[PDB]
Design a protein around this ligand. Structure first.
Ligand SMILES: *[C@@H]1O[C@H](CO)[C@@H](O[C@@H]2O[C@H](CO)[C@@H](O[C@@H]3O[C@H](CO)[C@@H](O)[C@H](O)[C@@H]3O)[C@H](O)[C@H]2NC(C)=O)[C@H](O)[C@H]1NC(C)=O
Ligand SMILES: *[C@@H]1O[C@H](CO)[C@@H](O[C@@H]2O[C@H](CO)[C@@H](O[C@@H]3O[C@H](CO)[C@@H](O)[C@H](O)[C@@H]3O)[C@H](O)[C@H]2NC(C)=O)[C@H](O)[C@H]1NC(C)=O
Ligand SMILES: CC(C)[C@@H](C)/C=C/[C@@H](C)[C@H]1CC[C@H]2C3=CC=C4C[C@@H](O)CC[C@]4(C)[C@H]3CC[C@]12C
Ligand SMILES: *[C@@H]1O[C@H](CO)[C@@H](O)[C@H](O)[C@H]1NC(C)=O
Ligand SMILES: *[C@@H]1O[C@H](CO)[C@@H](O)[C@H](O)[C@H]1NC(C)=O
Length: 1096
């Protein structure tokens, strides 16, 4: 029994620290004189029993008792930390029986009125101190969600930095003890040899256990081990499979030479009698067409004027996430309109007394707002969690309730509010975290700060107020060294309305018309005077009649069809015009004793089956796109197929009539190797061009999966707008992204079974419980912010030691007011039966009985569980409860791939709870459901179309060889466009998907006419494959290139000044790529493939 200090020598004039004095080792005190009874139960535990000798007085016991009485409510959550904490201080202070302090040096006064030990050291084991700190490094607080370790170690994250926190302080005396390391010649064995450890417990490997919300060990060590397929490989799976499949062929290709029915055959009796019907009474055909135009343009102007401007065109109705979105709105209100304003110092920190003297005027002038329309105020439209609550505003001015200027002491108060947001509460009891309103954590060196204002009232007067707010938000001033940025809900809508001016589209169609008319006019003398005008008017009549006919069935018309349906129907219609006309003008040279009517009947009997074939392939390709989830493409497919069939019937009825009438009112006296003819010698290079397009196809098919998915609303904001700076500020200065709410649909009363699946801060909670699972997901998923668990807070509201709030007078089931500051009312639960052991609280009627009292009063004196935090958090049923939500947030989500990953997390987490009925809601979730299936949907849709093209082409051609060649070319053109999407920065979303469908349609269009002409024309022909290839080019190829050149003129004219970035990305580059790739595959690859196929 050798000690290091004993005697309690010296006293002190005030403050009752009553400090102890040192002593030598050769000293043994008499003990057990009823101090051991007091030293056992109420201080540092019953581990000891009949301890032979101790080293502390009764005075030091009661001083140690009161010291630990102050510190134990701060640590009582995790029992292992509390126990080894008390065991530490007891083995130090009183159990100096075993020498746990050595080499005392400085005593204030040797034996005078001030004889005490100060500034002395202690040895200790590193393993022991590490296991002690590991069991205490992350601990939440009792009255709040703050880190209790942060109260006892600062921003420690270090055991030695936590040891030195214990060195010197205002309470009793600072001794600065802890010095762990003793590397060389400590002392003799058992004589001053001294290491320290007493079997330190932890959360695990111990009969005691803490919570997962507290301790990292209590969480599932089997954090989800399968982790899901990362879906990305250092080797691209599909690309590597493509490479090796081509390479095993690449070896062999060099080593193997290193060694009765006439249904569709004579269907043209129905096309004959229609044409013969078109030339007989053609005037009424033209009259009926031109009058039906008046009828439909009428319908469109008066009826179905709506143009489906709302965002309900992208989202699929009857889907999971849409039903979930409505279920959110009906119970928890709608998502608040957000108005975020950035204030930023470029190259430096923002916070200065001048900036506060500036925002002094701003925070209140925005409660005035430039005398808006009929005096609408922010206080009159704000967000109120309760009707008597004040208007909320997120800004560090609410750390000071608006009472902003404290010139002498603002830095410290702001550091206090940043680290410890409690006791920094605004007019509303809702606290504020720095990451939500600051770019960087250390506020004094933060490059920017975020002031966010939100509203609840979702109709058009709030938007008229925002229209009033912007003009003066632009007219507001700024210092020379400061920057600002801002945004509101209707900003993007107005930026879409801003650059809607595209006269370029009008002049584009102008140039297309001027060329399209100028076709084959001066071959055999001046001709073609106003015949192209008629065909263009009939083509336009097709889309107007379709638009009116489908507004008859009350069908919505998107902005997308306004650019696609004209572009598509023109591209096909003028192509049929040039085929019909040129075939007539060639019949005028062979056997001109055929009258004009027999000229056009013979032309229709030759080529109308090609039109029907192209039409069936396209319409089937468009009906496949009808079996889709979202209506933006569904309405497209209906519009498309119906506009195609209206054009396919008018250009073979009405245009046939106007052709007859035009060539009959003119006398047209007929009297008859050019440049287009000179390219017949180039075809001797058969194999080269096919290898070129084969490498073109293989290279495109390898780069095929590098296309990005999505669409960024941030791109489209026009140049020199007030939002281009805003998104760059969000990319760098905003720390929190979209909020996520976990909603549980329908449960009963707390039966203590259901709650063990949601409780986090307690011992008797499942491993698979909600808060613990979300804690282990939060380390690695898109959600980083901790969650608002009102059940843990509602149960922490009734613990007696941290209650100045829950009180009642006589067990009367009637509480005592918060404006009643008196001790006459006692705690709601017994100081002993507070049931921390298990998840303990009322289950039936008494659970609700205390729940209504919990949200009865706010939390100003007792800052825990007011009405303001969780007023709208749960739609409580009168009998038990209905639903409730638990909010959290995302890490900022800057990229579009981040948005997609955020959603796939929002779907993988909800599928982790087969026990419960829950789901996740974020405003943007309903918009990104498409991308989870868009890849395979593209593959299914296109491949289905291609195989359907194969079937229909094999039907009309009555042969599979040429039809397969058609299918191979049309497959190839899409692949090449897909890689060219990757290269041209085109994102893959619904918009570009529709345009790829019409790519497939037009690609089909080009090729069908040629491959139909590869069928024999027995009069004046050869069965020689190359010979009818030359036929297909000098007959149809010239007409095809003359329907191509105009569709190229559109691209070039569009590009010159179409400033709409979304139009310039997804429509110019798409279409330009389409016409180029498809013309090169149709004019070059197709003829070489066919001629070399037949070449034998
Ligand atoms: C944030 O905005 C403020 C306000 O415009 C700017 O702070 C500037 O910080 C620099 C560097 O600390 C100051 O330079 C110093 O100026 C004194 C003269 O008072 C000179 O003797 C020192 O040697 C040093 O160069 C500068 O004065 C200060 N600006 C003003 C108006 O006082 C800056 O734009 C941002 N803060 C940064 C860059 O730290
Ligand atoms: C925002 O919510 C309120 C819900 O009423 C609407 O704003 C305005 O609210 C005041 C009352 O707070 C209404 O004034 C009252 O109108 C009645 C006639 O209806 C009149 O007899 C009273 O003397 C009083 O003036 C006011 O009508 C109402 N609307 C407007 C335009 O001022 C408003 O409907 C909501 N905002 C939006 C954008 O929907
Ligand atoms: C709309 C979503 C999808 C995305 C874009 C939103 C981003 C910002 C605006 C989000 C991110 C976190 C959000 C957030 C965090 C916390 C709270 C407290 C809560 O009691 C009301 C909502 C409120 C006040 C909102 C405001 C809007 C914020 C700041
Ligand atoms: C204490 O310090 C002295 C030096 O004063 C040193 O010689 C000794 O080894 C240290 N430990 C003990 C117990 O004396
Ligand atoms: C909710 O309360 C109603 C009465 O207001 C009760 O009929 C109903 O059963 C409750 N819902 C439950 C228990 O799921």
């Amino acid at each position: 029994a050798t000690c290091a200090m004993y005697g309690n020598c010296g006293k002190k004039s005030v403050f009752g620290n009553e400090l102890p004095c040192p002593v030598p080792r050769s000293f043994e005190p008499p003990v057990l004189s009823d101090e051991t009874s007091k030293l056992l139960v109420e201080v540092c535990g019953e581990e000891w029993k009949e301890v032979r000798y101790a080293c502390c007085t009764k005075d030091q016991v009661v001083a140690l008792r009161d010291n630990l009485q102050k510190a134990q409510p701060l640590i009582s959550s995790c029992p292992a930390c509390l126990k080894n904490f008390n065991n530490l201080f007891c083995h130090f202070t009183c159990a100096a029986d075993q020498g746990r302090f050595v080499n005392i040096t400085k005593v204030e006064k040797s034996k005078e009125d001030k004889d005490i030990v100060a500034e002395l050291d202690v040895f200790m084991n590193s393993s022991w101190a590490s296991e002690f700190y590991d069991s205490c490094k992350n601990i939440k607080f009792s009255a709040t969600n703050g880190y209790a370790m942060d109260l006892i170690g600062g921003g420690a994250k270090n055991y030695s930095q936590f040891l030195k926190f214990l060195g010197d302080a205002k309470p009793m005396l600072g001794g600065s003890p802890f010095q762990i390391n003793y590397k060389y010649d400590l002392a003799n064995e058992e004589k001053e040899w001294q290491e320290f450890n007493d079997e330190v417990y932890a959360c695990d490997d111990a009969q005691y256990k803490c919570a997962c919300s507290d301790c990292q060990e209590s969480c599932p060590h089997l954090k989800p081990l399968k982790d899901g397929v990362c879906k990305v490989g250092p080797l691209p799976c599909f690309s590597l499979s493509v490479l090796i499949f081509y390479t095993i062929c690449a070896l062999f290709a060099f080593m193997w030479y290193y060694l009765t029915n006439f249904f569709n055959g004579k269907l043209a009796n129905l096309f004959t009698k229609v044409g013969q019907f078109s030339v007989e009474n053609p005037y009424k055909i033209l009259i009926t067409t031109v009058f039906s135009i008046f009828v439909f343009s009428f319908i469109i102007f008066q009826y179905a004027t709506l143009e489906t401007d709302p965002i309900n065109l992208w989202v699929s109705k009857n889907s999971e996430k849409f039903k979930e979105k409505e279920y959110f709105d009906d119970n928890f209100g709608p998502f608040y309109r957000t108005e975020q304003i950035f204030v930023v110092n470029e190259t430096g920190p923002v916070l200065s007394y001048e900036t506060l003297h500036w925002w002094f005027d701003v925070e209140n002038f925005i409660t005035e707002e430039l005398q808006s329309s009929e005096n609408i105020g922010y206080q009159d439209l704000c967000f109120r969690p309760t009707e008597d609550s004040t208007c909320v505003i997120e800004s560090f001015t609410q750390y000071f309730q608006g009472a902003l200027p404290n010139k002498d002491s603002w830095k410290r108060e702001l550091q206090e509010c940043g680290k410890f947001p409690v006791n920094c509460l605004p007019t509303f009891q809702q606290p504020l975290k720095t990451n939500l309103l600051f770019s960087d954590d250390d506020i004094l060196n933060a490059h920017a700060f975020v002031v966010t204002l939100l509203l609840t009232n979702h109709t058009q007067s709030a938007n008229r107020w925002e229209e009033r707010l912007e003009e003066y938000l632009l007219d507001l001033k700024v210092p020379e060294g400061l920057r600002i940025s801002f945004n509101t809900e209707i900003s993007l809508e107005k930026e879409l309305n801003n650059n809607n001016d595209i006269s370029t589209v009008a002049i584009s169609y102008l140039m297309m018309f001027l060329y399209a008319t100028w076709a084959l006019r001066r071959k055999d003398g001046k001709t073609r005077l106003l015949l192209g005008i008629s065909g263009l008017l009939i083509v336009l009549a097709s889309i107007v009649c379709a638009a009116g006919f489908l507004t008859l069935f009350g069908l919505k018309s998107t902005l997308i069809i306004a650019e696609v349906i004209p572009f598509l129907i023109l591209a096909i219609g003028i192509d049929n015009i040039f085929l019909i006309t040129h075939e007539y003008d060639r019949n005028c040279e062979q056997k001109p004793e055929y009258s004009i009517d027999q000229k056009i009947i013979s032309a229709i009997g030759r080529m109308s089956p090609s039109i029907l074939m192209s039409l069936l392939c396209q319409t089937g390709c468009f009906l496949i796109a009808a079996f889709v989830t979202m209506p933006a493409v569904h309405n497209f497919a209906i519009y498309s197929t119906v506009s195609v069939i209206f054009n396919g019937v008018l250009q073979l009825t009405a245009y046939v009539s106007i052709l007859s009438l035009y060539e009959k009112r003119s006398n047209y006296k007929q009297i008859t190797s050019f440049l287009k003819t000179f390219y017949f010698k180039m075809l001797t290079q058969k194999r080269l061009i096919i290898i070129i397009f084969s490498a073109w196809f293989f290279t495109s098919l390898v780069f095929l999966p590098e296309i990005q998915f999505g669409l960024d609303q941030t791109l489209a904001v026009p140049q020199d707008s007030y939002l281009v700076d805003y998104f760059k500020d969000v990319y760098s200065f905003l720390n929190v992204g979209p909020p996520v709410y976990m909603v549980v649909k329908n449960l009963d009363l707390t039966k203590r079974q259901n709650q063990q699946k949601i409780c986090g801060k307690f011992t008797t909670c499942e491993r698979d419980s909600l808060a613990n699972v979300l804690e282990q997901e939060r380390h690695r998923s898109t959600i980083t912010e901790p969650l608002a668990n009102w059940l843990d807070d509602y149960f922490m509201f009734l613990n007696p030691q941290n209650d100045q709030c829950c009180r009642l007078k006589k067990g009367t089931d009637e509480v005592c007011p918060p404006s009643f500051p008196s001790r006459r009312c006692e705690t709601c639960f017994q100081q002993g039966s507070w049931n921390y052991n298990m998840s303990g609280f009322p289950e039936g009627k008494d659970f609700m009985e205390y729940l209504s009292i919990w949200i009865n009063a706010p939390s100003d004196p007792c800052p825990l569980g007011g009405r303001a935090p969780y007023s709208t958090a749960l739609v409580y049923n009168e009998t038990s409860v209905s639903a409730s939500v638990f909010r959290t947030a995302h890490h900022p989500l800057r990229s579009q791939k981040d948005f997609i990953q955020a959603y796939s997390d929002g779907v993988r987490i909800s599928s982790s709870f087969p026990e419960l009925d829950m789901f996740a809601y974020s405003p943007f979730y309903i918009f990104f459901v498409q991308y989870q299936t868009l890849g395979p949907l593209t593959l299914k849709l296109i491949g289905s179309a291609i195989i359907l093209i194969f079937f229909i082409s094999s039907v009309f051609l009555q042969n599979i060889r040429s039809s397969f060649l058609l299918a191979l070319v049309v497959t190839m053109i899409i692949v090449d466009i897909g890689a060219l999407m990757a290269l041209l920065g085109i994102s893959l979303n619904a918009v570009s998907l529709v345009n790829l469908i019409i790519c497939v349609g037009l690609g089909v269009e080009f090729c069908v006419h040629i491959v139909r002409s590869f069928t024999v024309v027995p009069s004046e022909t050869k069965k020689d494959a190359n010979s009818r290839v030359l036929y297909s080019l000098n007959t149809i190829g010239e007409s095809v290139i003359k329907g191509i050149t105009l569709t190229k003129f559109i691209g070039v004219c569009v590009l010159a000044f179409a400033q709409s970035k979304i139009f310039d990305v997804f429509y110019f580059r798409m279409w330009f790529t389409l016409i180029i790739v498809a013309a090169l595959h149709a004019l070059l690859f197709l003829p070489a493939l066919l001629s070399l196929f037949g070449g034998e």
